[PDB]
Amino acid sequence: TLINQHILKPAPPPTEIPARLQVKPPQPAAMKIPNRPTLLGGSAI
Amino acid sequence: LFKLCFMSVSLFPAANESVILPHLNELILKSLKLSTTAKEPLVYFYLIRTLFRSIGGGRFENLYKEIMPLLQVLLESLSKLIHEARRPQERDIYVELCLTVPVRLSVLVPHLSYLMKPLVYALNGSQESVSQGLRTLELCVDNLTAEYFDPIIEPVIDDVMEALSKHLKPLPYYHQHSHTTLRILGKLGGRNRTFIKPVDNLKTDSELFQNVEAMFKIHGLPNEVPLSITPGLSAAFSLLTDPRPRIHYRINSFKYISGIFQLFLGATQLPDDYANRLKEDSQMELLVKLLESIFYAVSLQEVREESKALIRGTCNHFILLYFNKMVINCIFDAIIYALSSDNSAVRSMGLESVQLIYDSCVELFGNIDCALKFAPLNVMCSKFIHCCFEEPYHKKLAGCIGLEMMLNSLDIPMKYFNARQLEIIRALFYVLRDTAPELPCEVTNTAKRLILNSLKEWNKELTRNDVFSSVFQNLVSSLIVDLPNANEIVRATAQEALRTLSETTQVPIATMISPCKHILLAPIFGKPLRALPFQMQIGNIDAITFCMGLENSFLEYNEELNRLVQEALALKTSEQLVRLRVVCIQLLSLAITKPEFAAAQQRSNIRVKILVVFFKSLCGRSIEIIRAAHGGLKAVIDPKELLQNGLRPMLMNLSDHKKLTVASLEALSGLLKLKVGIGSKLLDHLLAWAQPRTLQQLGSQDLENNSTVQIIVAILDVFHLLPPTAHKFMNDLMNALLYLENNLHRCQYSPFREPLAKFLDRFPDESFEYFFNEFSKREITTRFVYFVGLDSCSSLRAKVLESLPRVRGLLHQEKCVRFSNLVDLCESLAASDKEWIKDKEELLGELLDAGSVCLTLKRSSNVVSPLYFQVDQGFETLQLLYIEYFKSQPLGHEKVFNFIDKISKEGLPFVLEFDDFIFNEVVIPTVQQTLDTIIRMTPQVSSLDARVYLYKRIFLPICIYESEMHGDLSRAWLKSFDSDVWKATGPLVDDYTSTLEDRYRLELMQLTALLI
Amino acid sequence: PWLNQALQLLYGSFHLDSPIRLSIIDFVAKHNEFLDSVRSLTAGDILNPLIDISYQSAETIHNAWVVVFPVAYSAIESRYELEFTRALVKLLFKDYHIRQQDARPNVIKSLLDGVGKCPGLHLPPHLVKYLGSNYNAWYGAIKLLEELSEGQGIDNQKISDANQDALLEVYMSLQEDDMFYGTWRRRAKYFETNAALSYEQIGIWDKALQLYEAAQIKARSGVFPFGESEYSLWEDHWIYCAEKLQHWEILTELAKHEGFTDLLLECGWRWIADREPLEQSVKTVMDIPTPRRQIFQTFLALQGFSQQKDTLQDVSRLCDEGIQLTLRKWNALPQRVTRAHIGLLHTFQQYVELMEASQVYSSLVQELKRVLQAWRERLPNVWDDINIWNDLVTWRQHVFGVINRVYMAYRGYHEMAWVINRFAHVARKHEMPEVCINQQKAEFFTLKGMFLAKLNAKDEANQAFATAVQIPKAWAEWGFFNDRRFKENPEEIFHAKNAISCYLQAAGLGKTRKLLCRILWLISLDDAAGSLAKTFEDHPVWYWITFVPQLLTSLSHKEAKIVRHILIQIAKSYPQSLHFQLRTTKQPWQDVEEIMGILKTAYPLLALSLESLVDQLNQRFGKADLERVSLHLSLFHHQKFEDIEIPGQYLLHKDNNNHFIKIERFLPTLDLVRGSNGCYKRMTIRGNDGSLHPFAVQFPAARHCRREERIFQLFRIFDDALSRKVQSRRRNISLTLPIAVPLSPHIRILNDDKRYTTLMGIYEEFCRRKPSTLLKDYYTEKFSNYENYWLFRKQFTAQYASFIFMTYIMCINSRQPQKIHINEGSGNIWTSEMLPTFYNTESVPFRLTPNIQKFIGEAGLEGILSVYILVIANSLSDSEFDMEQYLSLFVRDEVISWFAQQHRASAQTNQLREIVRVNVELLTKRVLQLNHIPNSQNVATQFVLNLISQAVNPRNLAYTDSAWMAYL
């Protein structure tokens, strides 16, 4: 058995839209291998 | 009311728990058993839902380990076969019972497996029972082990992670479900991505995806370009069948759907000279989905005048194709959903379309015989036959509803329905076989009556014993090899049909199955027992206990298993185990009771064993295993050392121990059906329970739910079947009743008022000779007038009606003058039959005279309150039955005789019973008669002038109702009215003195002011 | 979605005209009025309700835009497409802030998927990569970035190279590496990077990094120009392999100089004392947040709560607002869960153990043990990745660290020693025994016993194995030395009698098939003495039942007394495993009646219910009904005794016999389908779980049917060993051959269903509708919605290499197109009638005809089909003697059939040990030779490229047979 936590309350944190772009075709393309951990949400044009 | 009752045990973890606790085992099982045989079965599932919701985190729920494997396999077997009746997601009620069973997950939840396929119905299509579905999934990940839980979910692991991934969405979606799902997909760590495999369900251009190309005409492109006219067909099907969107989208979805459908229909090339011709792959699953939404559009208002207009068009269209293909079928697959649908409008349009495929087919060719050689009428036979062999429950309902109209519209050539005789009945036995017992019985009720009525219909023609060669006997050899098996509805109707098959074409039933009776026996003898588990072991007996109910069959060698039986008797699964031994009684009870076979066996010690085992079963641990065993002994009555051996275990259970259960009591009552010292013994048995310290502790508990009362009443049941001597147990038994009510403080009712009465049915003379002696006493005679008023004392009422006037003599011969007891006695048997009251009149005034005597002593202020409620409620009971006499005769001059006889009491007679009875004599040349009688009886001035005034409610409401519902006094008495009151003399009303007489004189003034 | 109002503007131009079409005397006149004069549908009442439908559902507007916009673009004439493209490109740059739909089938997804349906416009490739990644419709972008690359050439090198870079970071984003590494080496120009890319998708990262530092020194005043891209591969996949190899001190000093998240990542996890330099360096990069950077922000807020620097509540808020960012990256990915999601499924386990360690050392300043064991089991797979295995050890070490620091009857943790040893074992399970080395008495004797067994130390290893047995695997290893001794000594060695009794001592003590294949061959090694039969009675019941068709032949031969002893064991215990196989053989044939009699006394009901199923299949045998010809089977499941398992489950593994699907009922459809052999009668059995199982009885069975069961049996031995490894289970390369249980000497059933249309059935489908590019034409009109088409092609070419290996190895003869079954909903490819003979008869090495080679894609031919054929061989060579150990007893039933083939007699009984030892020596030198050459100068494969270059050669293709259909 295990005793579990609970969700608190509707708390709203919105994200924001950053500005840069990238081209680089290698797998790391940043600091490490996976990409959806290291890609900025939704970027501005 | 169930909501009010079940929330009370959630309010009290207290003495309000054990009163509901034993009933809910019955209330669940009798709600499953009633839902298969109800008109609206869904309220029996709303009931258990408010039972499961109203408890939670409860006390033990220890009585759910036994009903759980039958409640799951009821719910999982009709979460498949249910598709939204009105449109309510009624599959989403079955899952909420399945997922919220109120038990512990540890030992009870194992075997839940049943819960994996309704797990994905709760996660995928739901809205807030998703949270119920995620809650049970979180419980079974962290508690269980990966070596146990992973092989459970393997069939639906690839389907739960598609519905779990639709919930991971940001803050516009819930923070409740999207954060719970992330915890479930993290708390199992590497077992997330162990299912990630190459996909298999690649949608390869399905039927509504089919790019059908209509040729358009646009202004830029100067040609006839084709476009797909199905980009909204996926949204057309889902809009037409939902009640939630507005009606304007639902009407436009039909014009889209019928718009595509008319482009398939009219594109077919018609014949050039069809009258001269008369003298001579992926589309076909799209059209069935298209034509079905046309059929559903009949159930919509304000468009069914248009959707019917082409349903009659296309059914006319699809028969001239086959009548032109005679030189060379999407309507039938569309009809069978209309027949098996839910609304009565779409179902009737299925019934109208099956007529129009025939009523136009007789219009086209005329000759019905050649309209069965190659016509489409012949192929809708084998469509209705084949879809009884289908998997789903609803397609079985189409072939059973479609066939019963196809035998009541094709009635004329019944010679066609004799070559297809065996193929229909074999198709109609099969629908009885693979139908679950928990589905509603509308598919089996129309299948049971259709085998029965048809064999009375097309088998009223067979001649004699000579024509029984191959064709009819193969029909008999089909429904006798289906005699021994389980699922008794195919076993009971194999005997109901074979009886009515041999009722018409009058042939003995033993001679009918005679040339194939040895083929049936050979499997049933081969493997004797200890194989063929307990569902089959009721079926092996049932073919033999029917076969010995014939005139003669198999007079030798059933004794190979007759030992086998006695020993299965001599030793849910517990349900079928007591169902097993209850049928071995009937095989053994028909072994001895039938003549000409008991003398055949009697050389090698057979009957003795049967009798002895029939005993030892008499002390069994159940109830219904004793009842059929009681029927076996009561049938062999038409030995003594075995009777003394049987009485030895009987008297051992009948020992003075005060621990006799109710199973031995009814077995004792069954024994006396087939000395008198037990009456001395059983009175002292109950008195151990009947000490007042066992009843004052009871005090105010309900008596029907109690368990110590059921031992008391089952003791009292035995006195119905005593030895027939002139019993002296009349006085002390009734003194045991009156003592038992006063220590319960419970008057006018008790559950042990009923078995006291069946004893009094046995002795009518000794009862009334006890009651008539102690008649002036109140507290024992109140129990008498309930016993007379009971319907079970039909022999006691005949005693008190014949010996009626001997209790009338008591009222002629001082505080014990019980007028009050006689009134409730005569009221109790006047409610028996309305025919007793019509002749008694000297009784009824003799009651009211001695009642008026009692209202002289009771009107006396010498003592404080002598108004005893036995006397005054004697009059309010006397008067409502004195009116029960009046509406049996039509005379309007007897009601004015009740008035002067009550002058010493209550003034105007009693309300709510007589003021609406004068109002039914007031509301015809008999209305003139009542006004003659009033002016007759009123100059009796000695009738106490508050009665003389009292005709103000009976004279003037006649005339002011006559002068309101008729014109003005349009309808004898006037010649007699003016005779006396307007020739009146001095002593009466024509004097002048201010007394209470002037209240009468206003009845005379206010009447003359209405005559003018 | 403003495409709804753009439709009605486009719908107004429709000439709503009256003809719309696709392209007894009184009754006929009544309808003829109806079906043509009342049919007469104008175009209005189709499109006018389509407006009223599309205002409700957002998918109709996407479904109607893609069918009317290519009709709209086809009337934009010449000299205005360049005006149209620049006016369309300007629209896609018009940000409406974020053009904030970011919802279901929105405007950008429906606009980009409407462009690809009309040829002639060619939107810029780094805008397609941006619009497809940022909003959605990844597969709407690969439809455009492959249309520009393949087919015609765009006649500009700078538009062709900017397309390829835009493609290679779509494949990297969706984490398919096999299309990433196959598009690169199709493109790259050096030789030193075509070698290092292919040594890196295999997975040996020591010869991968050497060929990158030897790639850059080919540059740096080298004459070669090397490109701008292919230089972002050198300097980034030097640092990819140097962090796969776990060299974390060398790339510390490297990231000291540039200075970015790589410094935060390696120096961070590989925090209480150096918190102040780490905390401010996070906040320089914590803006523009990602799902990775919040884990650094949360963890230092957690180890500040451990020292009491940071309050609890803040870690709950930091885990709450960080999960909602992880949610937004999950929602940006496609619907079907692939390997692109596995990076987020490990983020999930970080967040659960970050709200769990926030209560383990909240109540720290017997619950700890529960948490510890849950943690000791919540680990990823052994095949997952060596990085994301290492990113779990790091976290766990940090955590247990704090507990130890604060706990200052045994209080000792010794749990950091567990997560290191568990990681050191999986580090050798992957590859490369160098990452593992840098971190209970019989096992030391077994190591010294195996060390003496490598050299020629017979008595030393025998004394060590006796020392190990006096203190498991050594109980079979000593006989394995005796098995090595018996092959080394002459034919009269008696140590095999001391060996077959040795492996059975611990045979009851999983991988029992590797010793049962060795047992069941040396008993048939001419045992005229038979002394091992008494050794078999000196002292494992499930694991023989896969070897049943070998066992039922040995009853007629010698050792019949002991092989009877192991079939009386099975039928008493598992009745369903053997009843169908012993009925196919019907004391040359007389001893099995005692086996049949044992099968009927024990379980009297099961043998009775099973034969009632066989004879009903035996008597009778577009859609038909089971009701007319097989009405006994509709009445079967009412009188069906207890349980009957669905057949063909004991052929496979699943060795515990618990969750086998039993027969529920027979579906009443006999879906006979005109097959290639003729027609058969496909039935359908419904299972316990609702899963329908379509079988297919075939009426005859030619004399190879007792040989092809032995061929499929051999790859029931390889396929589970194919799934156990790391580079083969990462790609899920199931050999997918079907079950075929026999029921009689003439009738056998086998599992096949709809959508198994063979390759020749595709060919007559095309001529019925009446070159190369016929699979490319059939599978695009069938698979619209390109997400389905790209996945089906990728699963086709990945399964074609499993067809090549079983055809090359143990050489199969001429595969006609009607002998190769392809699935149409999954892509699984299997062959019928595998008959090997095992020499080169007259062959091109395998079938790769250019109607397949166009459908492969010429960039999965380099990245999938050339490396899956290698990675199958790279495991089967080196699992546990799959090319040597099992292959003995599967050729000694081939060479006894070959002597019965070429003539009637059979000879060479004493030489039969040498005919087996020769034809196993070819099959161990046919797998092993096409593995990778251990020097670093070859590309990586170079022999499976040697064979592919032969099989596509048009000389070697047309020189062979002409009924082989070498054009399709």
- DSSP assignments along B291-327, one per residue: HHHHHHGGGSTTTHHHHHHHHHHHHHHHHHTTTTTT-
User: What is the number of residues in chain C?
Assistant: 968
Cα B247 to Cα B261, C53, C67, C280: the distances in Å are 21, 12, 28, 61
Amino acid type, C138: W
Which residues in chain A have their CB less than 8 angstroms from residue C134's CB? 42-43
DSSP conformation letters of A6-38 = -------------B------SS-SSSSS-STTS
C34:B313 CB<8 A: yes
CA distance B2 to C471: 71
Chain mean position to CA B266: 52
H or E segment and range at residue C748: strand C748-751
Among B268, B309, B263, B311, smallest CA distance to C39 is for B263
Residues with Cβ within 8 Å of residue C463, at least 6 apart in sequence: none
Phi, psi of C748 (to 5 degrees): -135, 145
Work out how many CB contacts closer than 8 A connect B with C.
258
**Under 8 Å between Cβ of C677 and C473:** no
Which residues in chain B have their CB less than 8 angstroms from residue A13's CB? 171
**Under 8 Å between Cβ of B800 and B760:** no
Cα B501 to Cα B158, B460, B462, B745: the distances in Å are 54, 9, 11, 63
Which residues in chain C have their CB less than 8 angstroms from residue A26's CB? 172, 232-233, 236-237, 240
Which residues in chain A have their CB less than 8 angstroms from residue C232's CB? 24-26
Q: How many CA atoms lie within 13 A of C164 on its CB side?
A: 22
Nearest to C169 among A29, A37, A45 (CB): A29
**Angle formed at CA B495 by CA B490 and CA B497, multiple of 5 degrees:** 90
Among C626, C605, C611, smallest CA distance to C684 is for C626
Shortest CA distance from C125: residue in chain A = A23
Nearest to A29 among C172, C290, C388 (CB): C172
CA distance B430 to B451: 12
Among B936, B822, B838, B823, smallest CA distance to B885 is for B838
Q: Write down the residue that tokens 């057309």 correspond to.
A: B236
Q: Which tokens go with C110?
A: 């429906």
Residue B791: Cβ within 10 Å count: 8
DSSP conformation letters of C483-523 = HHHHHHS-TT-STTHHHHTTTTTSS-----HHHHHHHHHHT
Whether C654 contacts chain B with CB within 8 A: no
**Under 8 Å between Cβ of B202 and C792:** yes
3-class SS shares of chain C: helix, strand, coil, % to 5: 50, 5, 45
Residues with Cβ within 8 Å of residue C421, at least 6 apart in sequence: none
**Under 8 Å between Cβ of B800 and B836:** no
Residues with Cβ within 8 Å of residue B434, at least 6 apart in sequence: C637, C638, C665
Nearest to C290 among A17, A29, A37 (CB): A37
**Under 8 Å between Cβ of C62 and C109:** yes
Q: Write down the residue that tokens 């039509």 correspond to.
A: B890
Beta bridge partners, C758, equal: C821
Nearest to B199 among C59, C782, C791 (CB): C791
**Under 8 Å between Cβ of B587 and B558:** no
List the subunits that have 3+ CB pairs under 8 angstroms with A. B, C
CA distance B25 to C608: 41
**Under 8 Å between Cβ of B501 and B461:** no
**Under 8 Å between Cβ of C195 and C233:** no
**Under 8 Å between Cβ of C439 and C423:** yes
Furthest C-alpha separation in chain C: 109
Among C293, A4, C290, C339, smallest CA distance to B183 is for A4
Shortest CA distance from B199: residue in chain C = C826
H or E segment and range at residue B784: helix B778-789
**C826-855 residues touching B, CB cutoff 8 A:** 826-828
CA distance A10 to chain B (A): 7
C236:A27 CB<8 A: yes
User: What is the number of residues in chain B?
Assistant: 1012
Q: Write down the residue that tokens 């009784």 correspond to.
A: B843
Experimental method: cryo-EM
Chain mean position to CA C469: 40
Q: Which tokens go with C794?
A: 């990728």
Nearest to B171 among C45, C46, C324 (CB): C324
Which residues in chain C have their CB less than 8 angstroms from residue B434's CB? 637-638, 665
C345:B193 CB<8 A: yes
Residues with Cβ within 8 Å of residue C861, at least 6 apart in sequence: C182, C797, C853, C948
**Inter-helix orientation angle B607-616/B573-592, to 10°:** 140
**Under 8 Å between Cβ of C328 and C293:** no
Among C865, C693, C887, C875, smallest CA distance to C793 is for C865
Buried b or exposed e, range B733-742, using 16+ CB within 10 angstroms: bbebbeebbe
**Inter-helix orientation angle B376-386/B393-406, to 10°:** 140
Kindly give the pairing relationship between strand C695-698 and strand C748-751.
antiparallel
**Under 8 Å between Cβ of C930 and C874:** no
Q: Write down the residue that tokens 């069809």 correspond to.
A: B274
**Under 8 Å between Cβ of C651 and C720:** no
Among C290, C326, C335, smallest CA distance to C137 is for C335
Residue C458: Cβ within 10 Å count: 16
CA distance B586 to B584: 5
CA distance C63 to B230: 9
CA distance A10 to chain C (A): 11
**Under 8 Å between Cβ of B520 and B481:** yes
Tell me which of A17, A35, A40 to substitute to probe the interface with C (most C C-beta atoms closer than 10 Å). Answer: A35
Cα B64 to Cα B21, B26, B74, C326: the distances in Å are 11, 12, 15, 43
Q: Which tokens go with B742?
A: 């006063």
H or E segment and range at residue B125: none
Phi, psi of B849 (to 5 degrees): -75, -50
List the subunits that have 3+ CB pairs under 8 angstroms with B. A, C
**Under 8 Å between Cβ of C99 and B246:** no
Q: Which tokens go with C905?
A: 């007699």
Among C385, C395, C396, C398, smallest CA distance to C426 is for C385
**Under 8 Å between Cβ of C346 and C380:** yes
The CA R_g of chain A, rounded to the nearest whole Å, is: 17
CA distance B927 to B914: 19
Shortest CA distance from B225: residue in chain C = C71
CA distance B711 to B689: 9
Q: How many CA atoms lie within 13 A of C781 on its CB side?
A: 7
DSSP conformation letters of B688-744 = HHTSGGGTTTTTTS-SSS-SHHHHHHHHHGGGGG--SS--STTHHHHHHHHHHHHTT
Beta strands in C143-207 (DSSP E): none
Work out how many CB contacts closer than 8 A connect A with B.
16
Shortest CA distance from B176: residue in chain A = A7
**Under 8 Å between Cβ of C854 and C772:** yes
CA distance C524 to B484: 53
Nearest to B178 among C327, C345, C785 (CB): C327
CA distance A43 to chain B (A): 17
Residues with Cβ within 8 Å of residue C685, at least 6 apart in sequence: C646, C663, C664, C665, C666, C667, C692, C693, C694, C695
Residues with Cβ within 8 Å of residue C809, at least 6 apart in sequence: C923, C926, C927
Q: Is C433 helix (H, G, I), strand (E, B) or coil?
A: coil
Among B910, B904, B908, smallest CA distance to B877 is for B910
Cα B782 to Cα B545, B749, B775, B824, C404: the distances in Å are 52, 11, 10, 8, 87
Tell me which of C236, C239, C355 to substitute to probe the interface with A (most A C-beta atoms closer than 10 Å). Answer: C236
Residues with Cβ within 8 Å of residue B686, at least 6 apart in sequence: B712, B715, B716, B736
Whether B192 contacts chain C with CB within 8 A: yes
Shortest CA distance from B363: residue in chain C = C24
CA distance B200 to chain A (A): 26
Which residues in chain A have their CB less than 8 angstroms from residue B138's CB? 4
**Angle formed at CA C890 by CA C886 and CA C893, multiple of 5 degrees:** 155
- Show the DSSP H helices in B483-602 as ranges: 489-503, 509-512, 517-526, 536-547, 559-570, 573-592, 598-601
Among C689, C727, C713, smallest CA distance to C199 is for C727
Among B317, B280, B310, smallest CA distance to B294 is for B310
Among B86, B176, B57, B73, smallest CA distance to B115 is for B73
Q: How many CA atoms lie within 13 A of C873 on its CB side?
A: 29
CA distance B776 to B784: 12
Burial tier of B753 (Cβ tally within 10 Å: 0-12, 13-18, 19+): middle
Residues with Cβ within 8 Å of residue B509, at least 6 apart in sequence: B498, B499, B502, B550, B551
CA distance C343 to chain A (A): 6
Q: How many CA atoms lie within 13 A of C681 on its CB side?
A: 18
Burial tier of B19 (Cβ tally within 10 Å: 0-12, 13-18, 19+): middle
Q: Which tokens go with C589?
A: 């044939």
Whether A4 contacts chain B with CB within 8 A: yes
Beta bridge partners, C14, equal: B218
Q: Which tokens go with B600?
A: 């055949």
H or E segment and range at residue B758: helix B755-762
Q: Is B227 helix (H, G, I), strand (E, B) or coil?
A: strand
Q: Is C313 helix (H, G, I), strand (E, B) or coil?
A: helix
Which residues in chain C have their CB less than 8 angstroms from residue B279's CB? none
Beta bridge partners, B215, equal: B226, C21
Residues with Cβ within 8 Å of residue C562, at least 6 apart in sequence: C523, C533, C536
A4:B180 CB<8 A: no
Cα B544 to Cα B502, B524, B571, B588, B597: the distances in Å are 19, 9, 22, 11, 15
Nearest to C36 among B192, B193, B266 (CB): B266
What's B20-82 look like in SS3?
CCCCHHHHHHHHHHHHCCCCCCCHHHHHHHHHHHHCCCCCCCHHHCCCHHHHHHHHCCCCCCC
CA distance B241 to C281: 59
**Under 8 Å between Cβ of B705 and B19:** yes
Burial tier of B910 (Cβ tally within 10 Å: 0-12, 13-18, 19+): middle
Whether A2 contacts chain B with CB within 8 A: yes
Beta bridge partners, C812, equal: C836
Among B385, B489, B490, B369, smallest CA distance to B427 is for B385
* Torsion, Cα of B790, B796, B802, B807 (10° steps): -80
Amino acid type, B34: L
Q: Is B228 helix (H, G, I), strand (E, B) or coil?
A: strand
